Symmetry: D3
Subunit: 236 residues, 6 copies
């Protein structure tokens, strides 16, 4: 195998890859939006696919849950498979008082409670920062689709089942728009390989107000977000 976690051969991934946490959602994206899709990985059930979107090569693959998991898959894609651009597509919570369930959030940089980025920069603050060309492609794609977007900071946590008091309130005070679990691990790996990464997420829950999206609202949100991402890949 080309890597311990991927059975794809070199060349089996396009230079642009969408990634989501759930491998079954990766399969949904390939089936519904990729032309001439071909499954290229099934190791550990982490399905990945390669085909085209509007004539341009494009891949989609699951990355699992958490920074350690996306770090494995993204490091391999950039290093072994020579990927140039990864766009993470997912869902998030929000704490921001001006962000609402169903909003589309385009991430410019992400904080974290993980140690992985301090360990890369001699213990200092290393901002996990999206590539500007990627952010701009997502923003402009949404503008062309007449879909409004929130643009700003995410926060990537190691702990889904948080017990931490005061965190949500501090995140809200500094206008973090998205809370998820992976983006802060992706962007520094792109940096290391001279490559590009971004993230776009739809708000499923407001963590402060407790508003929540219905399953139908989540479907429409996903459809908006994935079309934004797909159209962005044509400009990248």
């Amino acid at each position: 195998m080309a890597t311990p976690h991927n059975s794809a051969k070199v060349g089996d991934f396009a230079e642009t890859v969408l990634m989501c946490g759930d491998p079954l959602r990766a399969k949904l994206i390939a089936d519904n939006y990729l032309e001439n899709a071909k499954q290229v990985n099934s190791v550990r059930g982490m399905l990945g696919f390669t085909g085209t979107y509007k004539g341009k090569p494009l891949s989609v693959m699951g990355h699992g849950m958490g920074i350690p998991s996306i770090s494995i898959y993204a490091e391999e894609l950039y290093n072994v498979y020579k990927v140039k651009t990864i766009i993470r597509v997912g869902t998030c919570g929000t704490v921001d008082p001006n962000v609402h369930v169903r909003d589309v959030c385009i991430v410019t940089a992400s904080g974290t409670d993980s140690n992985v980025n301090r360990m890369r920069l001699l213990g200092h603050d290393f901002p996990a920062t999206a590539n500007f060309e990627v952010v701009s492609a997502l923003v402009e794609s949404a503008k062309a689709l007449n879909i409004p977007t929130q643009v700003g900071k995410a926060y990537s946590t190691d702990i889904f089942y948080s017990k931490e008091q005061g965190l949500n309130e501090a995140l809200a005070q500094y206008h973090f728009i998205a809370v998820e679990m992976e983006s802060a691990g992706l962007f520094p790996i792109a940096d290391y390989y001279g490559a590009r990464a971004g993230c776009i997420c739809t708000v499923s829950d407001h963590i402060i107000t407790h508003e929540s999206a219905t399953p139908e609202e989540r479907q429409t949100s996903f459809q908006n977000m994935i079309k934004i991402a797909l159209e962005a890949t044509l400009k990248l």
Copy 2:
């Protein structure tokens, strides 16, 4: 769904659960060692199963890669599914000079470069410690099967593709026997719920000498380890 990551109903999991990173390995364990095994989860491809081993209810499920991933699944198993004992079964590297490829390592406690345990104990050192009854059950099971074991410390890292200089040498000097990515997140969650956890791993690689197990040797080591874990479940 009972949890955002598991389609099982309460009661679908036995009180004892073996967990490995790869859901396809969980299916192999259920197929080959569990009687009357039924699949109880498929969400995100993270296959879980429930059957019996020598008459006693037992489950097996994948937990994904990394502390954040196992934390989600273990928190849900203890909290929602009322599991009482989780034994992680997997592979590891070693840096210890007196430990060799194919050795079976039983983990008493695990260090980490993750922040998750400092955040549980006001920033202090919180040892991720296996339950003594679980450790002893594994040790005695291996004795009955005439399989030698190494017993001691593991180290759980967030970063599979380590670039850290000096780490391996310090781990070796203090006789850490296993390097993996999850056990340090499992043990404190078991503590939180007043439950039990342990870990057993087989050495696939020596990180210092660079010895490595042939695919046939890894099959033999896996069969040894899983028999130890399965027989231990009868005493727990």
Copy 3:
């Protein structure tokens, strides 16, 4: 006085302020690029001015050297003077192998060795992140002026006379494009007040190769950068 560090009255500052470290450079900017200019602050010699650029009111003020200094002035400008946008205009070093002396760098986010942002976010990683509208306005203004730009991360240090081994090589590995001393302190304050900030710098020195801009090159670069910033204010 409206603040302990500023003699201006509320309203004396325009809603957009350009800031540089040297107050005499703020005077040079007012003298050479603003019409209708008046001095509005002289406290501590930290000269500030308000005039117009192509008809639109604009202010320019020194911020002194280091995160604590810019934090004082920016907190006051957003809170007391009701400023909406601050753009830092400065010089920097670079470590990036594809960035050269004379280059104009537009900052998307900034790392730091300061503690000020950990203290804002319960000790976690808080990325000091530029406002996307400001970044975009700078990028588009440079394109319209036919000036190439580098876009990416800065690193803000507390110590001008660094003695730290290994830092430059790590910054280079992750493609930090600018090394300066203030931007990481500015962006979180803008966040706190729900306001906007950005930073644009010209490269005076390559920290790795030791190339250094001549006096003539520094004048060329300054004239490019300040025109980019001034034209961007018209779109903000």
Copy 4:
């Protein structure tokens, strides 16, 4: 002298040493439980003794209060005196809701607010972990003596007169069974020398309920603990 802190000659200590904080308690142990006893150290009043228990050579020595103090004595015992096993015998508080005054606690691993173990492992989490053969010998000795035991985590603090809010409640939540001041410093030193260590303590106080052992209860529990430790040495 063979060390700066010990007047004993190499060979004067048996390969197994019981250690307690108070040198006058080391003397009580020698006087009441060792035959053929000889005093082998008087330096700094830190009395140490060597004799026999049921025919087998055994030493007992004070270690003073705190991690720095036990670290000096244990480093010397392993390095200079070639000791193979140190068992700490002490008293502790408890926070655990199912542990009571009078209980005997056998320590599997120890947390701490000391920096000494982070400094051994490149700033990471290093669990101070008891040797499994020692833990098991103590557990089986107690079973053979018909004495129930609690087995689990300790917490070693640098500060006897704690002023820290919320600590006790977090220790209780994760079921720490013993609070004392030394074991977290002993176990990594044993690791460094490829040797063995353990700890057994009697509960003098419940930190949450404020129950406290009477002098009679402290005698009963001491008699239990020391007999467990002594009988365990015959198996080690």
Copy 5:
């Protein structure tokens, strides 16, 4: 220019330099308390002067606000200008129950929330400590002038506009007498160059009780402090 921040020639600064944050206060000191004063620096508006006090050469110069700013100027004064002694003269707040507005505080050592001193001593606690000859000269000069003094610890913060809860109360508990923003950065630089530094401040505000000196009181206490500092320079 001899440094990037100073137009003075080597020799233009006397061996002893008084420094205050505001360059216009440096000018006031030179104009009203030095004889034969001449301006030796105007770069960045950071006025510096050299004259005499009672016939002995003495310089005074602004240092700007915050540890990064004073670090630049002090490093240059010791390294390039061969200054032997720097005395910071400033104002402060106090939290100490036994210190009041108007009091003159002589600093023996300074705490901080800056990272600059940990970075100098391998991450450990490095006390920013005033030189004993300087402290003693200030104490003895005040005694000869019949001016009472408080002698003790300062705290240097990076953040003028503090939002930190509990800090003032902890500083009060341990009898910190002065809160300011620079001295902790000065003392270690003096150590590095084998030179001398001290700090003397007047209390403008009581941070706990909210008492505040009137403008007249601030002038009277400034006059006391500057006379102490000037007379101390004759003993140094």
Copy 6:
């Protein structure tokens, strides 16, 4: 007993106490320098004595080895026994290029690798600072005795048997004059109780050059140091 570690009754200690690590040296000081000395404590062998020196009440007591040990005894002395001044008297190593074996070092402040002071000041830098009146009394007493002294910083380590690379060289660069194990824990406790503390040590070893005092030289150094300390108590 009035404390868990001291059998003295309230009033049995004088307001001034000399403390050293070795209780047998406390007894030597009492026997050779105090008049009408009475032993007031022998709990844990930590001998303490009270008598007079040149007519003035004075006590001497051992404090054991390390910050946790001295913290217990000093906290009790200030809180229960109402002690006003503690002077630690001991030996040290040095790293400073202009400090030599046999030198007398008077400590103004102490660094540390302990966590105890960060935990007192919300994780910030808290300088362990000697009381200026105590420092001055020691300096002046040595002047009157014509004994040269070095005055400056100490470093208090938790680990006698250091394995840390680069520490000694950094301590030397910043002119730390004494390396020992206790003073950084003493000074903040004196602060807490509104009391006074200092430290004086003689250099037994040069850590860089490896020079070492002979036993006879250590005796003469001790005699010089203890006379300085005793004479200083008359001024306090």
